[model samples]
Target chain A: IMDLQTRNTRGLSTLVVRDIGELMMAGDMAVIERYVADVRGKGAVLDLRIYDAAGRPAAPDGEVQAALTSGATAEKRHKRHVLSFIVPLANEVRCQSCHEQGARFNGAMLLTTSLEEGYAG
Target chain B: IMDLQTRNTRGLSTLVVRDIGELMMAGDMAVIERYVADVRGKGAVLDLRIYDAAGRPAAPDGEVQAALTSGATAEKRHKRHVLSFIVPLANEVRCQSCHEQGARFNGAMLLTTSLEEGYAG
Candidate 1:
C-alpha cells in the first residue's frame, strides 16, 4: 500500500494527487523526481511514502528521507526496466547510426529537457 | 477556462484528472500526448475540451477534434516553448563535442526510449 500526498484546489473544485501509486523499479526514482518537479509550483504540495518492496522502511529505520531518491527507481524483481534514461537517435547521430557515408563529423546537442522540475509538486 | 477528464477509484478514495488545466504554447501538445500515454489504461477515461488560447473553440469553431494531437503543443503568444523533444550529449558523442582529438570517429547509439505509448492514457 502507498500513501499519496497532494494539495487541495478548492477554486478548481479539484483534489489533486501530484504523486500517487506504487513503484517497482530503480528508474522510478527519476519518474517521481521529475513528477515532483512538474507540479511543485502549480499550487500543490506533495509528500508521500510507502513501505519498501521488502515490506519495510527503505533506508535506516526511522530515517526521515529514504537513501534512494524515489521508490520508483528501486531495483525490484517484478517490474524491470520500466523507466530508462538514455539518448535517442535523431539528426545529430542519425547518419552514424544509419548511413555511415554521411556527416560522421558533425556534433549537435539534442533539445529534449527533463520533466523533474516541471512535474515536481 | 478548460475541462479536466479523469476516473475515480472508490477503494483508493481518489479522484483523478489525467489531463487538467491550460496550455500556452505549441509544445504542450507533446506534453499532453506524453501525459496521456503515461496514464493510459490505469483505469482512467479522459475526454476534455474548452476554449482555446483565445478563449474560443480550438478548431474550426465547432469541429469536434481540434486538429491537434494535444493542446499543449500549439504555438501561442503567452507561453513560448513549454515542451520539446530532442537528444542529449552522452558518452557516444561526449568526446566529440566536449573532448575531441580522441575516439571522435566512433559513434554509439544512446539508449533513451520515449514515453508516448508508455504514458498514453
Candidate 2:
C-alpha cells in the first residue's frame, strides 16, 4: 500500500486539487483549509499551498510563493524534481454571493511538488 | 484575455487541483464542493469530478469515472483531443480529523479535457 500510494502520489495529488475545486463551487469557503490538512493525516507526505490574484500568499507556506514571484513553473534538483503550478482565481457568473463581476480573485492555488528519483515516482 | 486564459488553462487547472489539496490539508471538508463550482464560474471550461477508493463516483459526473475504469491516462482525436486523469485520495497522517486509519478514501479526483486543433492550441 505504501509503495502504491507513493508511486501514485502525483495522480493522487491531482485528485486532491480537483476535489478542492468542487468544494469551492459549492459555496463552502470555511472548510477549505480544514480539508487540506486532513489529506496530510492520511499518510501522504505532500506540500501544497495557495496564493491570491495579487500574488500574495493566501494559505500555507512560502516556498511556492517564491516560485510564483519568480515566474518559474517547474523546478528540479539532484535526485528530485520539483514542479510549481499556479492558477489565478477569478469571479464568474456563478460566484455572486461572495464575489463581484470583473473583480479580481482574492485566492489562487499554488502547488509545488518535490519528488526524488526513487521515492517520488 | 480569453486567448491567454485559454492557453494557460492546463497550468491553471493544475493550480486549481493543488489549491484543493491545500484546503484538504487545512482540515476543512465542507468547502470541497462549493470551491470547485466557483472555479467553473471564472470562464474556465473544465470538467472535474471525484470517485471513491473502490472506484465509485463520489462527487459529480461519470465521464472521468469511466476513464478511470478503462485505466486510460490521456486521449487524442483528429483535430480534437481529450485527456483524462485520475488520482486516488488516501488516509495520511495529517488526515486524521475526518478520515479513518487505514481506511480507504471515499473520494478521488477526476479531470477531463477536450480540445480542437485550432481552438485547443
Estimated TM-score for each candidate: 0.16, 0.30
Q: What DockQ does model 2 achieve?
A: 0.04
In angstroms, the error of model 2 at A74 is 17
Q: What's model 2's lDDT at B69?
A: 53
Instruction: Indicate the worst ten consecutive residues by lDDT in candidate 1 chain A.
Output: A1-10
Cα misplacement distance, residue A112 of candidate 1 (Å):
22
Question: Which residue runs of candidate 2 sit more than 4 Å off their true CA positions?
Answer: A1-121, B1-45, B59-80, B118-121
| lDDT (C-alpha) at residue B48 in model 1 | 21
RMSD after Cα superposition, model 1: 23.7
The two-chain DockQ for each candidate, comma-separated, is 0.02, 0.04
| Most accurate candidate by lDDT | 2
Candidate 1, residue B44: Cα displacement in angstroms equals: 6.4
